[PDB]
Symmetry: D2
Subunit: 134 residues, 4 copies
Amino acid sequence: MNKEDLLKKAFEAMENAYAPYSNYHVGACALMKDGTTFLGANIENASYGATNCGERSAIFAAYSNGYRADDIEALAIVTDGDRVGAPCGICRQVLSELLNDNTPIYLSNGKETLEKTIDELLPMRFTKEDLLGH
Amino acid sequence: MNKEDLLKKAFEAMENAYAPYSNYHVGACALMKDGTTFLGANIENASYGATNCGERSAIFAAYSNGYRADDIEALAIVTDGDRVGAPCGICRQVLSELLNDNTPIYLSNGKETLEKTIDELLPMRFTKEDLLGH
Amino acid sequence: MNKEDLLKKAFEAMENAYAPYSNYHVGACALMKDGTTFLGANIENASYGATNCGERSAIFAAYSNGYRADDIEALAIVTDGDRVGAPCGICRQVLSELLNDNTPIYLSNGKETLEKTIDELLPMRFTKEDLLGH
Amino acid sequence: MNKEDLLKKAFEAMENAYAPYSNYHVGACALMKDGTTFLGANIENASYGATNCGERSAIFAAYSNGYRADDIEALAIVTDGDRVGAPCGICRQVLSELLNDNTPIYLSNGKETLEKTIDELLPMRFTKEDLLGH
Ligand SMILES: [Zn+2]
Ligand SMILES: [Zn+2]
Ligand SMILES: [Zn+2]
Ligand SMILES: [Zn+2]
């Protein structure tokens, strides 16, 4: 699957968002090396702190089906915002552990597209081995 | 799909848990009325507060693919613990919004099985309409 | 300090809430046996999942200053809602860990007042011992 | 208060951490322009996702007592780790909203000290304006 088709999957996921409170929709799609895709959308809650982000929905779905970082080809995350948005800090913390440093993260607001890797988005990362080796 | 087969799916999901820090594995499976299943497993992070529970993984996956409360037939959540466990308070807050009150939640530790609905697990719920009608 | 004066502290805390997105204000006050009080208010974030609840703000402040469950006398949580609200499921999971079973939790919307304990609000608790004994 | 004395307060807070699961202790101290300090420490939960970080404990306490970003002089965050640690991505998302761009964040492991600002720690921030303008 090419970048444009993966972004199309993420825009399809964006229509599945559950965002009664903000009305702000985020779509994501995690593409596995074997070609399997996992959609993700943001899912809000009346208790706002229980809200989940769309890119977390997608990666948690992939891991729950037995995929691991080494099995993931790419992640796309999209909005219809005025500028291209990046994953929030919570999602960066998750992706810092669950993605390898070469996995592209494609970001698009439907007008422009950017490509990042997780190390660019989160300096001075606190890692699994920082904790396990403590 | 019967209860025993749904529990078997959740036990499968339990083997996909990512829990390097606690070693405690939770599996879940959300069954849609159309027969589709969504696995969920707990996914930990070196920053413990970014951990996601397995039943959240499963329900977020279902919603991210366009299913809503009315489309969900049942949810199973399993462990290998010494007693049958219920969803934690975070997950109860999520399920209080994302499940209807008649949807069975099957709980099993592999030795005993219980059936609950969300209202039993969370008294005095704070709901979408409590917030939107404020 | 009596119940009415503790509720008054929680109403003071409610005026400190940071809720630019929902405009829904929650106040809390944790009272220590030595007479010390800790205010808490809800504090929202543009990434909704990073929002903190007021009763968590209060209890985390108490613990961060060295207090523990046996050092705490009571917790008050208040709103201006149409009915008396209880802590959300996230907060119940926290209070299940950080309060003793019978420590009073006073709830008020300014029109009615209720008294609860954590056991009444959270059946089938997942506890420290369930995890440590696994 | 000077930088060394603020770090000393954060090290005092670190001794108040509640980390029964990881045994990893973090302390923080938020210093207000009026001289008031707020300690924060990490506070774990048997449901790991309900864990709170120390720097969030501190900043939520400040806001719950009425302080806002313009009042915050500095934040210190400390550990005893092998290398100097930065706030995790969750905490960066919170600090992006609750601190001004140039408020100093002092980091120390007791052997080395660094000074950062939130802009250095979190590129491509998703802000209140991005949401409110949507
Ligand atoms: Zn996010
Ligand atoms: Zn849970
Ligand atoms: Zn809450
Ligand atoms: Zn943190």
